[PDB]
Amino acid sequence: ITGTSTVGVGRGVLGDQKNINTTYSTYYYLQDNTRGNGIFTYDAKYRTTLPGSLWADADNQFFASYDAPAVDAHYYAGVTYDYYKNVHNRLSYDGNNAAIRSSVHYSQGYNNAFWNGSQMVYGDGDGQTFIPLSGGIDVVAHELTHAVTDYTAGLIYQNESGAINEAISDIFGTLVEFYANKNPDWEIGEDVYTPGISGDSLRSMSDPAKYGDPDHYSKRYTGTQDNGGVHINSGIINKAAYLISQGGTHYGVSVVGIGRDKLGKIFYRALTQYLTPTSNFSQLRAAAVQSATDLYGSTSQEVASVKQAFDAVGVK
Ligand SMILES: N[C@@H](CC(=O)O)C(=O)O
Ligand SMILES: N[C@@H](CC(=O)O)C(=O)O
Ligand SMILES: [Ca+2]
Ligand SMILES: [Ca+2]
Ligand SMILES: [Ca+2]
Ligand SMILES: [Ca+2]
Ligand code: NA
Ligand code: NA
Ligand code: NA
Ligand code: NA
Ligand SMILES: [Zn+2]
């Protein structure tokens, strides 16, 4: 909408106060004009019609319980935009400052969030398995990274290419979580998963087997569930990325860690310059090796660590 840029204040899903960029025109809208061609947050009003209504508020204060998922979807989209711009010199998900659109209060009791090809969509959860999913910065960044992938490598969402697509979203979701530097970790969705249980999440990158996911190619799932295991076999790549960053010895193979910033540079370059819609895990290894070679040289520690990490998870 056309209107002047304003600064509202509210509370997110976890009760934390934060400022949000809004737009004033009769109402205050969740429209952030400070980033690209805008960040826009919508109310789906417990229905499944999308996007729903651009979020309108009478007084620019967002402290109602019903407001909290919208506050966080809007704010964490901004953090994710900042990460890609400041760390990777990428302007929004398409590299040309596309407007970022999110809808909250999707459906009733909806225990998921997703990117639908055009926008981010967040359920409220059922209160037991999930609370509103935009409360997790890693979840928000995971979803927006699917948009980046769809404008770059275009990894098909099935079998090994789909597992790479998922791992890329977990990797950059986690790197955004570290960038914001509140309570960062290598697990996925802990802030919004199972409010009655401490310490758990949907997936672990440091130990995928904690939640039943493979941590070695010999344990890959080859059935048809979950688009051929895209959220299952992502563990093999998540573990490799964890090892590249943090190091460790896994199934007897030692990896020298090179840290999060270099992990991000290597995988961002692989995503944008080497991967294609049909890339498999072995092609991902090759893309990461060549990306690290471009950045650091063929004889570098960084290239050696990429090779060790893919060796450790059985990807040749
Ligand atoms: N981010 C979504 C991807 C999808 O729409 O399948 C999810 O991982 O649940
Ligand atoms: N954290 C993401 C990943 C997934 O869907 O599996 C989400 O809840 O969508
Ligand atoms: Ca209000
Ligand atoms: Ca965390
Ligand atoms: Ca996390
Ligand atoms: Ca929990
Ligand atoms: Na999705
Ligand atoms: Na995608
Ligand atoms: Na699991
Ligand atoms: Na390929
Ligand atoms: Zn995903």
Rounded to whole angstroms, the Cα distance separating 120 from 170 reads 16
Q: Which residues are annotated as a binding site for Ca(2+)?
A: 57, 59, 61, 138, 177, 183, 185, 187, 190, 193-194, 197, 200
The CA 143 to ligand 11 mean position distance, Å, reads 6
Q: Would you tell me how many other CB atoms lie within 10 Å of the CB of residue 199?
A: 7
Rounded to whole angstroms, the Cα distance separating 138 from 150 reads 18
**Domains within the chain, CATH numbers bracketed:** 6-154 (3.10.170.10), 155-316 (1.10.390.10)
Q: Which residues form ligand 2's pocket by a CB distance below 6 Å?
A: 112-114, 133, 139, 142, 188-189, 202, 231
The CA 128 to ligand 6 mean position distance, Å, reads 9
Mutate to test the pocket of ligand 1, among 133, 140, 146 (most ligand atoms within 8 A of CB): 146
Ligand nearest to the CA of 290: 10
Rounded to whole angstroms, the Cα distance separating 22 from 48 reads 25
Query: Would you state the structure tokens that stand for residue 21, as one six-digit string?
Result: 């960029």
The CA 27 to ligand 7 mean position distance, Å, reads 31
Ligand nearest to the CA of 187: 5
Q: Position 28: which residue type?
A: Y
Q: Which residues form ligand 1's pocket by a CB distance below 6 Å?
A: 112, 114, 142-143, 146
Nearest to 14 by CA among 187, 202, 200, 189: 189
Q: Which residues are annotated as a binding site?
A: 57, 59, 61, 138, 142, 146, 166, 177, 183, 185, 187, 190, 193-194, 197, 200
What backbone phi and psi angles, to 5 degrees, belong to 267?
Answer: -75, -30
Rounded to whole angstroms, the Cα distance separating 23 from 30 reads 7
Which residues are annotated as catalytic? 143, 231
List, as one string, the DSSP characters of 32-95: ETTSTT-EEEEE-TTS--SS-EE-EESSSEE-SGGGHHHHHHHHHHHHHHHHHHHHH---STTS
Resolution in Å, one decimal place: 1.5
Nearest to 58 by CA among 100, 132, 6, 123: 6
Residue 28's Cβ-count burial label (10 Å; 0-12, 13-18, 19+) is buried
Nearest to 102 by CA among 165, 47, 50: 50
Mutate to test the pocket of ligand 1, among 114, 171, 193 (most ligand atoms within 8 A of CB): 114
76 with 67: CB under 8 angstroms? no
Kind of pairing between the strands at 100-106 and 120-123:
parallel
In the structure, ligand 4 is a single-atom ion and the residues with CB under 5 Å from it are 183, 185
Indicate which residue's Cα is closest to atom 2 of ligand 1.
Answer: 114
Mutate to test the pocket of ligand 2, among 13, 106, 114 (most ligand atoms within 8 A of CB): 114
Rounded to whole angstroms, the Cα distance separating 212 from 59 reads 47
173 with 141: CB under 8 angstroms? yes
User: What Cα–Cα distance (Å) separates residue 22 from each residue in 7, 25, 232, 306?
Assistant: 6, 10, 39, 43
